[PDB]
Amino acid sequence: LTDEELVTMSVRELNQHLRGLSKEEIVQLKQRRRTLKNRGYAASCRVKRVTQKEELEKQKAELQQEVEKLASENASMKLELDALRSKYEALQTFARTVA
Amino acid sequence: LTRDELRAKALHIPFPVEKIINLPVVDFNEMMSKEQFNEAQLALIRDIRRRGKNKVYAQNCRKRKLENIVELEQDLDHLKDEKEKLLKEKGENDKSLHLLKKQLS
DNA sequence: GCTGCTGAGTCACTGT
DNA sequence: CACAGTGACTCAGCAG
């Protein structure tokens, strides 16, 4: 019995493969299956933590470039807004100097 | 008595397991000096030190993984707040530019 | 009893 | 050489 064949086997079909096995070899085969199942649980846990980390890092990189772009364009527009307000105010004081 | 301590006692190693693991390498070498250990004693001492130190490395490596996820989720939390704050600032600037252009044409 | 999960210890590596 | 880090495997032990 190869590895994944023993892991995919249900506990009901496992009892159908008790041909010529002693009481102990039935035990060791059950612990062999449990060990193989535990190896898959650890691998399944490691995969789950990796995708979570990679996804959180993907969202952070996207939001960091969004915030960096937002801060940059806001500073540039604020420059043009302040310049336009300066010319508007300068024209305001000149408008107060008329007859 | 731990399994490590029993094995060290069985091989007549006179040093405490704690000192084998935790001593800085300079003090560890001083402790090992002036001895006469055979290959079996040297191998067990090296095995106890390596396992004892690697145990803590794995502990720290798993603690860092958990702390790194907490820091990432905090980074996301602040970035969403900074994005919201920057959008409000962009709105006040867009509304001020609009009012100025309206005042003119 | 089994199933999933998970905290640790260990191994076989790689990195500084 | 030393120490340090890390994915994978292992077992133990708890919850379901």
Author numbering:
A (entry chain A): 24 to 122
B (entry chain B): 454 to 558
Verbatim from the authors:
Nuclear factor erythroid 2-like factor (Nrf2/NFE2L2) is a member of the CNC family and plays a central role in cellular defense mechanisms against oxidative and electrophilic stresses. Stabilized Nrf2 then translocates to the nucleus and forms heterodimers with sMaf proteins, thereby functioning as a transcriptional activator and upregulating the target genes involved in anti-stress responses. In this study, we report the crystal structures of Nrf2/NFE2L2, a CNC family protein regulating anti-stress transcriptional responses, in a complex with MafG and CsMBE. The co-crystal structures of Nrf2–MafG-CsMBE complexes show that the CNC motif stabilizes the conformation of Arg residues in the basic region in contact with DNA phosphates.
The sMaf proteins share a characteristic Tyr residue in the basic region (Tyr64 of MafG), while CNC family and AP-1 proteins have Ala (Ala510 of human Nrf2) at the corresponding position. Interestingly, when this Ala residue of mouse Nrf2 (Ala502) was replaced with Tyr, the resulting mouse Nrf2(A502Y)-sMaf heterodimer preferentially bound MARE-like sequences with dG-dC dinucleotides located on both sides of the TRE core in vitro and in vivo. These results suggest that the identity of the amino acid at this position is a critical determinant of the differential sequence specificities between CNC family and sMaf proteins. To gain insight into such specificity switching by the Ala/Tyr replacement, we solved the 2.3-Å crystal structure of the complex containing CsMBE2, MafG, and the Nrf2 A510Y mutant and compared the recognition mechanisms of the base pairs located on both sides of the TRE core (dA4-dT4* and dG12-dC12*) by wild type and A510Y Nrf2, as well as that by MafG. On the other hand, dC12* is directly hydrogen bonded with MafG Asn61 (corresponding to Nrf2 Asn507), accounting for the dC specificity of the sMaf proteins. The bulky side chain of Tyr64 is located close to dC12*. Thus, if dC12* were replaced with purine, there would be no space for a water molecule to mediate the hydrogen bonds between Asn61 and the purine N7 atom. In fact, in the crystal structure of the human Nrf2(A510Y)-MafG heterodimer bound with CsMBE2 (containing dG4 next to the TRE core), no water molecule is observed bridging the dG4 N7 atom and Nrf2 Asn507. Thus, the bulky Tyr at this position of Nrf2(A510Y) and possibly its equivalents in sMaf proteins are incompatible with water-mediated purine recognition by Nrf2 Asn507.
